[PDB]
Design a protein around this nucleic acid. Structure first.
Length: 1117
RNA sequence: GGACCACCCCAAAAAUGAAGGGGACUAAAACACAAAUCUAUCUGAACUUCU
């Protein structure tokens, strides 16, 4: 019986009591909802025809008691009178079950009132510490210090041994294995015999409640009532005497037999009672054996102790004198703390992209250095430091640094200046340290707009000139023009069809601060699916070429996309406009649909009670309902809150596209006699743009300038100085982190209800016209292609041998390079000599006969891909004969087997499997940074929670800093280890665990705490001297303080492997060590109906599937 | 040490059903103008409807 998450209501805890709260207003809804749940649904109260019809009848009928009346509500002998549609003497049968329903509601009503806000900053002897006020947090605050931690473990072991006696558990493990279904009560009623409730309710329940009223002291109650159970005496001390008695070492032991009994009950509710669950039967052996169970419960109370101490440190920076942490505070706090862990992550990628752009052989980072400034010696006071930008000019890498600078920036550098460039790398490195110090100074003052302030940083002569040549209104016109050309618009439209387009649609480049809008891709893809379900009148372009259709749709998307973000979202979100005209329409289109008029079970019924009076506030209510009902649906689904919100922005867009009034975008697209006249138009303009990247200010031809005269822009940033440094960070970022940085700045604005990065998000969108997808005229040294190719068993290195290698000239084709898109990302992040070593171990090479088979099968896919689409059409919509007999089935099987063995073979010689491998290795390493950033935030929280004094702890978590008294030099791990040694100076072996001889094994193997500097600096990527399965091993050792993070390491790695089409079965041995048992590429099922003949056509090739398993296991030497 | 196959919080006279609830409160995800294609689509309830 779910109580919350049903309207907009949710349990939100407050100062005086916890409260059921309708989404926005803080009024009490606890009495309103719990009176509404006080009803007996009459289908409970009961092959598939008589049963299935009666359940639909009595689900409408509810039996409630308002007020002490048995009247029924619309949605045995007394049950049939309702079925024959025909008072109080009859319905008194149900009060036996409604009194059990009433007592559940009164117990839940008291369950919400005690779930109140706990954490309160206090001020005892001039230090600001945070304590809990709840009954449990009084126990955790007693054992808060690290000295009393061993007494906390012993009291759990003492309480566990008084409740569970090694054969009561041993019989209880047997009953969990020896059930399948409907036998839960035998486990349950035996477990109540272990606790002993039958000699508790019947002997002490009514006795002890009288004596609580008299003696008002636990010491006097035990003297008054002797011979209590050790668990019952533990329960009374928790409820009636824990708030108001002082905690001695003798009376602290009463609270632990109740804390252990909760944990054993929570294990039964998850692994026995509810759903069993779907996990295993081998899991149960690991959980419930007595020596494992005694270890697991104390490994779970020590988790709950450490989350308290971590919360007392987290709520010490974020809270004033002065305040109690209500759920309004806590939820806003988490969305600001998740903001910080995304800016720590964006400065770890920006270091990493600055290490590839300036190739360091040491892979050792970065201060201080990257400009030449001398410093005084101990003797003589005369030296010159080793600046890495001056290490260019010793190795003469300036032909290669300028090559790496071109991939990130597209500015024409001149390495002969060499003082202008060393000032440019200073302004990149000072910009990353500026947002690094912003994380520190978002503690004393909660203003996130000042972490991108970039104060006291003057831009270079390059970075000023580079920014103004990417903002001014003439250059943005030649990026709109490049996006129009690259989307094949000039080839599939007439000249006046697009001049009429450019006179109307304006290009902004304004964030508009609207939450939860769908992207237009993922919304264009729904059109042909939803075309019949909604009154759309659209025609997706269909042509018999299927490479022409991909290029018309790529022009169909881009032309409608600038309508969607530019003109549409200003119309569709103004208070004048049709938002609720469409929102009430789609709820009616689902209600008045067929087969929902049969049974009124349409899914959009839970939206009809929402009005909200504003289209912008309506989304913030739907996006609030979405965030509270995430994680309920399994497999998961097309989720309702996103599916409903994609219908509004697609019905409303196609209504905005019909009314006023451009609708010639359908027939783009149609006149084949026109496309002959525009066939070479894309080639003439692309030849111009390659002459534009070689030199900008040449000349603009007349046919170019007729488009550029009409392209209109919304807003220009006008060059403030602090955006100049924020631009240099964003060019050092891939697309996945750049949208995470786009998302985290939007979620900061919607959480704090202010606009603070509206100048920053406007500059992210001026990088949204920069992704070119024909990337990026980089050089392709032909030796570097040929480390993956084997010409007669040897790597092709000579450029003449590459022409000798192939014949069909899908490679070299002199005198040029075919320049595949896969080698862009593998070289920008290179990670190019690494994937040589992985491919050499796995034998992944491009054979001659395997490349020769490519050009044979390439002239056969167009026969196979067309024949697959034709036979699939007989399967989906026959409409004529109700055929697709078995002779069509076997012909469809041989069609998709040939597409499968070609697409696996196309992706190998087009290097798309290396672009998938590089995309997979880097996606894992960008995710594991996000766990070491949680570790850095939760490291200062445990230390500030343990020690509210000792202000030197904050001096650990600084990054230059020149101010520190005790911990001067080093990064976080190098300064934490000397904090750890001077704290445990009397408690070896813990010093010798971090001793200077032990630390060399600890650092080289990247064990317990040196994996944090290893992951966050991306030190895997040049050499990989420790494998991923040992990085993931050492990260779970690092995150062992928090169990929800130690468990979510492997869950986030399996889910990354599942996005790239792999099903991973890891094994974790008896030693803490991870190995892959099996990888399989996930099966694309064809013909999902007909229930017997599926085809399973796996996505990634088996040769790539082996090659990923080597990548996790690859270690240097 | 065994992840994937979470975690935390509140509820013990009557109301021993702790056989219950809660969590944007806490992680994982999801949402976002990168990419990638061979999975009919569309309704629904804990396989079943559709033109």
């Amino acid at each position: 019986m779910k109580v919350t998450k049903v309207g907009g209501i949710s349990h939100k805890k407050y100062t005086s009591e916890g409260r059921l709260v309708k989404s926005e207003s803080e009024e009490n809804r606890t009495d309103e909802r719990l009176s509404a749940l006080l009803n007996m649904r009459l289908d409970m109260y009961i092959n598939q025809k008589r049963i299935g019809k009666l359940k639909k009848f009595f689900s409408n009928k509810m039996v409630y008691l308002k007020d002490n009346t048995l009247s029924l509500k619309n949605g045995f002998a007394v049950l049939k009178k309702i079925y024959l549609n025909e008072n109080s003497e009859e319905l008194e049968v149900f009060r036996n079950d409604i009194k059990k329903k009433l007592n559940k509601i009164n117990s839940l009503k008291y369950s919400f009132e005690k779930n109140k806000a706990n954490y309160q900053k206090i001020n005892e002897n001039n230090i600001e510490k945070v304590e809990g006020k709840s009954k449990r947090n009084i126990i955790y605050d007693y054992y808060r210090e690290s000295a009393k931690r061993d007494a906390y473990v012993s009291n759990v072991k003492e309480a566990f041994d008084k409740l569970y006696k090694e054969e009561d558990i041993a019989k209880l493990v047997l009953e969990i294995e020896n059930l399948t279904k409907l036998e839960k009560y035998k486990i349950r009623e035996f477990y109540h015999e272990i606790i002993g409730r039958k000699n508790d309710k019947e002997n002490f329940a009514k006795i002890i409640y009288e004596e609580i009223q008299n003696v008002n002291n636990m010491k006097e109650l035990i003297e008054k009532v002797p011979d209590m159970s050790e668990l019952k005496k533990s329960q009374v001390f928790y409820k009636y005497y824990l708030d108001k008695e002082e905690l001695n070492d003798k009376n602290i032991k009463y609270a632990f037999c109740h804390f252990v009994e909760i944990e054993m009950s929570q294990l039964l509710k998850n692994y026995v009672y509810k759903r069993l669950s779907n996990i295993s039967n081998d899991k149960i052996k690991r959980i419930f054996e007595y020596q494992n169970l005694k270890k697991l419960i104390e490994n779970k109370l020590l988790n709950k102790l450490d989350t308290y101490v971590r919360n007392c440190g987290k709520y010490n920076y974020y809270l004033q004198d002065g305040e109690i942490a209500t759920s309004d505070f806590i939820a806003r706090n988490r969305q600001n703390e998740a903001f910080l862990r995304n800016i720590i992550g964006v400065s770890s990628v920006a270091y990493f992209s600055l290490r590839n752009i300036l190739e360091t052989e040491n892979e050792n980072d970065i201060t201080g250095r990257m400009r030449g400034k001398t410093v005084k010696n101990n003797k003589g006071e005369e030296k010159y430091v080793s600046g890495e930008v001056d290490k260019i000019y010793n190795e003469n890498k300036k032909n290669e640094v300028k090559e790496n600078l071109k991939m990130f920036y597209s500015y024409d550098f001149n390495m002969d200046n060499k003082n202008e460039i060393e000032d440019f790398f200073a302004n990149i490195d000072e910009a990353i340290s500026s947002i690094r110090h912003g994380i520190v100074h978002f503690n004393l003052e909660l203003e996130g707009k000042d972490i991108f302030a970039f104060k006291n940083i003057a831009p270079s002569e390059i970075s000023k000139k580079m920014f103004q040549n990417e903002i001014n209104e003439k250059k943005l016109k030649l990026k709109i023009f490049r996006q129009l050309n690259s989307a094949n618009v000039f080839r599939y439209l007439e000249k006046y069809k697009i001049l009429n387009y450019l006179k109307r649609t304006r290009f902004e480049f304004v964030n508009k601060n609207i939450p939860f809008v769908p992207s237009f891709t993922k919304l264009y893809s729904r059109i042909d699916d939803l075309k019949n379900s909604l009154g759309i009148y659209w025609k997706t372009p269909k042509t018999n070429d299927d490479n022409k259709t991909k290029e018309i749709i790529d022009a169909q998307i881009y032309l409608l996309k600038n309508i969607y973000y530019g003109e549409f979202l200003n119309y569709f979100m103004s208070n004048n406009g049709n938002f609720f005209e469409i929102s009430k329409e789609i709820i009616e289109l689902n209600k008045n649909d067929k087969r929902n008029l049969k049974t009124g079970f349409y899914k959009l019924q839970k939206f009809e009670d929402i009005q909200e009076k504003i289209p912008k506030e309506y989304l913030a209510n739907i996006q609030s309902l979405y965030m509270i009902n995430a994680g309920n649906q399994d497999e998961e689904e097309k989720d309702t809150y996103i599916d409903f919100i994609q219908k509004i922005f697609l019905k409303g867009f196609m209504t905005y596209l019909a009314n006023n009034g451009r609708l010639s975008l359908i027939y783009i697209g149609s006149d084949e006699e026109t496309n002959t006249s525009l066939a070479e138009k894309k080639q003439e303009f692309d030849k111009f743009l390659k002459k534009y990247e070689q030199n900008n200010n040449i000349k603009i031809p007349y046919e170019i300038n007729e488009f550029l005269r009409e392209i209109k822009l919304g807003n220009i940033l006008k060059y403030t100085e602090r955006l100049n440094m924020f631009y240099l960070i964003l060019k050092l970022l891939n697309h996945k982190e750049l949208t995470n940085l786009k998302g985290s700045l939007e979620k900061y604005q919607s959480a704090n209800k202010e606009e603070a990065f509206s100048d920053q998000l406007e500059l992210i969108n001026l990088l949204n016209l920069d992704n070119n997808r024909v990337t990026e005229d980089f050089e392709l040294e032909a030796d570097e292609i040929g480390k993956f190719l084997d010409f007669n068993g040897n790597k092709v290195k000579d450029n003449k041998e590459l022409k000798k290698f192939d014949t069909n000239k899908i490679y070299f084709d002199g005198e040029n390079i075919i320049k595949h898109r896969a080698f862009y990302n593998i070289k920008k992040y290179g990670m190019l000599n690494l994937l040589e070593k992985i491919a050499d171990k796995a034998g992944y090479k491009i054979s001659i006969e395997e490349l020769k088979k490519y050009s044979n099968k390439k002239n056969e896919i167009e026969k196979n891909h067309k024949m697959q689409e034709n036979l699939h059409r007989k399967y989906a919509r026959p409409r004529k004969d109700e055929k697709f007999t078995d002779e069509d089935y076997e012909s469809y099987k041989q069609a998709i087997e040939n597409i499968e063995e070609y697409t696996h073979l196309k992706n190998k010689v087009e290097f798309n499997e290396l672009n998938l491998l590089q995309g997979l290795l880097l996606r894992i390493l960008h995710r594991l940074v996000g766990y070491t950033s949680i570790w850095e935030r939760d490291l200062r929280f445990r230390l500030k929670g343990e020690f509210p004094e000792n202000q030197y702890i904050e001096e650990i978590f600084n990054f230059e800093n020149k101010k520190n008294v005790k911990y001067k030099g080093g990064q976080i791990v190098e300064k934490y280890i000397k904090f750890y040694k001077e704290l445990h100076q009397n408690d070896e072996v813990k010093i010798n665990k971090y001793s200077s001889a032990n630390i060399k094994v600890l650092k080289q193997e990247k064990k317990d705490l040196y994996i944090a500097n290893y992951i966050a600096a991306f030190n895997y990527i040049p050499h990989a001297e420790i494998s991923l399965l040992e990085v993931l091993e050492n990260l779970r050792k690092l995150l062992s303080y928090d169990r929800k993070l130690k468990n979510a390491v492997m869950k986030s790695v399996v889910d990354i492997l599942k996005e790239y089409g792999f099903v991973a079965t890891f094994k974790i041995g008896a030693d803490k060590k991870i190995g892959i048992q099996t990888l399989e590429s996930e099966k694309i099922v064809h013909l999902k109906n007909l229930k017997k003949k599926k085809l399973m056509t796996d996505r990634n090739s088996e040769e790539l599937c082996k090659l990923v398993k080597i990548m996790f296991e690859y270690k240097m030497e």
